[PDB]
């Protein structure tokens, strides 16, 4: 079974957004469904829940007459229409799956969240560099590479190393806010000394709202 | 609101040891009360429902007890996997509301920074900026001094760091700190150094290179 969210991105404060949820594996008219967000270094917090029928909608008092949440049945597909966004509303929006369809929770099903950046900040792709391992007579058994993430907005970006084949050791650090207003990050991973003129090492970068995608290949020297 | 204060706010114990997290509502929600587990980044899991009843699919280790305004999760034992922000949630009342979370790290034996320095990539330097970052993998606790030297003058205001959250398998961290200088500046000087201080290190260590 799977919640599969869409619908994320970049929103301009005072606009509109939907988001949808996307059940798999199970039967949506079952099931009450709800919407549950994480701000920024905060914990969750209950937005709106829909039951069996689309007049069935509840909603926390800061969203009353702004959001509203409803469903298709026929589609597998929950929603919610925001309206009038503003920046206490940036947030990682998950859709929940209630264990039945009278009451709505325990939520026995989270879907993997989608997160609205509520700004007026203009959409930037990064720029990758390499972080490239020492080859020397010198160095140690154990080379350390990476790719270098710089100034994008808004979050998130996704990084993963030879399409996915190589995910032992990595390490994908959490952006840092620059004093600039773009985001940079780096993401890492130690391999063998041995490896490292037999073996390519390139880095998968993505950042969805620029539609950047982008493959760097990191070799010694 | 129901409102639902949970403590402690964070909570350091070894593997294999017991640990109890309270929930505390502020008028009863009889039994009307579930326990989720967040993991960095992933999906919420939920644990226990109706205070005492433990989720399908979930280890015998995780249970719940209480009623009316207090109630307890409790993980027998702990395990490296369990790093997360733990949540309770009650369904007696709208809204629905959530505790404000325990916040659980797996304190494992000291282990020490491997350490390695980057310089600034050729295609970078045309852009005008150049970027030196310091890495250190692997090590517990989380607290470590990076230091930057520039010609062996301390630097000041021009660095970021960041931390990984903790393994899952092995509850380390990774840190990294990024020098960001002017290419002139950059241009203009010879040695780069990373100085690390750390419980794991007898004395701290140096990572250097030489611009060229």
């Known amino acids: 079974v799977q919640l599969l969210e869409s619908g994320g991105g970049l929103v301009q404060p005072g606009g509109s957004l939907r988001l949808s949820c996307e059940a798999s594996?199970?039967?949506?008219?079952?099931?009450?469904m709800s919407w549950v967000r994480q701000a920024p270094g905060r914990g969750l917090q209950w937005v709106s829940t829909?039951?069996?029928?689309?007049?069935?909608?509840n909603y926390a008092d800061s969203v009353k007459g702004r959001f509203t949440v409803s469903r298709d049945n026929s589609k597998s597909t929950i929603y919610l229409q925001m309206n009038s966004l503003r920046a206490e509303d940036t947030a990682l929006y998950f859709c929940?799956?209630?264990?039945?369809?009278?009451?709505?929770?325990?939520?026995?099903?989270w879907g993997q969240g989608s997160l609205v950046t509520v700004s007026s900040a203009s959409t930037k792709g990064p720029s990758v560099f390499p972080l490239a391992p020492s080859s020397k007579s010198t160095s140690g058994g154990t080379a350390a590479l990476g790719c270098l993430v710089k100034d994008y907005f808004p979050e998130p970006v996704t990084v993963s190393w030879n399409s996915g084949a190589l995910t032992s050791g990595v390490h994908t650090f959490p952006a840092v806010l620059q004093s600039s207003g773009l985001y940079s990050l780096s993401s890492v991973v130690t391999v063998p000394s041995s490896s490292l003129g037999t073996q390519t090492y390139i880095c998968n970068v993505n950042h969805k709202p620029s539609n950047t995608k982008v493959d760097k290949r990191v070799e010694p020297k | 609101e129901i409102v639902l204060t949970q403590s402690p706010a964070t909570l350091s114990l070894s593997p294999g040891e017991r640990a109890t997290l309270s929930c505390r509502a502020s008028?009863?929600?009889?039994?009307?009360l579930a326990w989720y587990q967040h993991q960095p980044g992933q999906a919420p899991r939920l644990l226990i429902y109706?205070?005492?009843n433990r989720a399908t699919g979930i280890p015998a280790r995780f249970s719940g007890s209480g009623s009316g305004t207090e109630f307890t999760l409790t993980i027998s034992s702990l395990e490296p996997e369990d790093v997360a922000v733990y949540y309770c949630?009650?369904?007696?009342?709208?809204?629905?509301?959530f505790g404000g979370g325990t916040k659980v790290e797996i304190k494992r034996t000291v282990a020490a920074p491997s350490v390695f320095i980057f310089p600034p990539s050729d295609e970078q330097l045309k852009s005008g900026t150049a970027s030196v970052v310091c890495l250190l993998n692997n090590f517990y606790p989380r607290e470590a001094k990076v230091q930057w030297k520039v010609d062996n003058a301390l630097q000041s205001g021009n660095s970021q760091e960041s931390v990984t959250e903790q393994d899952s398998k092995d509850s380390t961290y990774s840190l990294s700190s990024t020098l960001t200088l002017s290419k002139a500046d950059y241009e203009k000087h010879k040695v780069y150094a990373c100085e690390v201080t750390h419980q794991g290190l007898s004395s701290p260590v140096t990572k250097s290179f030489n611009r060229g």
């Open positions: 929940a799956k209630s264990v039945r369809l009278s009451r709505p929770s325990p939520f026995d099903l």
């Open positions: 594996g199970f039967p949506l008219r079952d099931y009450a």
């Open positions: 829909i039951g069996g029928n689309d007049n069935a909608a």
């Open positions: 008028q009863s929600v009889s039994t009307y």
């Open positions: 109706e205070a005492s």
């Open positions: 949630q009650q369904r007696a009342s709208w809204p629905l509301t």
